[PDB]
Design a protein around this ligand. Structure first.
Ligand SMILES: COc1ccc2c(c1)N(CCC/C=C/c1cccc3c1N[C@H](C)CC(=O)N3)CCC2
Length: 119
């Protein structure tokens, strides 16, 4: 039977970096997401009462550039984890919530065709 494809880091990078660059270019919308959450500096000391698995753009980038991803779905799941964290922690009337809803719309649009074309 057909086995699960493991990818060359170089192919994963060359196929998925663009969808990540599309998020990063949105400014200010990507600013909330660029850097691991510091609950002290951001003045949100209850952050980890609500979020339990942190994730950010800088973490996804390093994972991609040091080939820690073997399958493209691991990348996709990490992006959605970062967005689901934001939707869960922040109010619907907040900028981080609204920035999240907007970077999600961009991502769905970049990523859905890329995944058609990968094994
Ligand atoms: C307390 O905010 C600050 C203070 C100084 C400056 C801030 C924000 N901006 C944006 C930084 C990114 C915000 C990050 C952020 C700030 C408040 C709440 C959330 C944030 N995001 C991550 C995703 C955590 C989250 O869910 N909700 C840069 C200029 C200096």
């Amino acid at each position: 039977s057909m086995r699960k494809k493991i990818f060359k880091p170089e192919e994963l990078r060359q196929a998925l970096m663009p969808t990540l660059e599309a998020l990063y270019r949105q400014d200010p919308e990507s600013l909330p997401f660029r850097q691991p959450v510091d609950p002290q500096l951001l003045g949100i000391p209850d952050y980890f009462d609500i979020v339990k698995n942190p994730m950010d753009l800088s973490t996804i980038k390093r994972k991609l550039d040091t080939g820690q991803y073997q399958e493209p779905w691991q990348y996709v799941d990490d992006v959605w984890l970062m967005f689901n964290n934001a939707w869960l922690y922040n109010r619907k009337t907040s900028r981080v919530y609204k920035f999240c809803s907007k970077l999600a719309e961009v991502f769905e649009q970049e990523i859905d065709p890329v995944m058609q074309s990968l094994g």
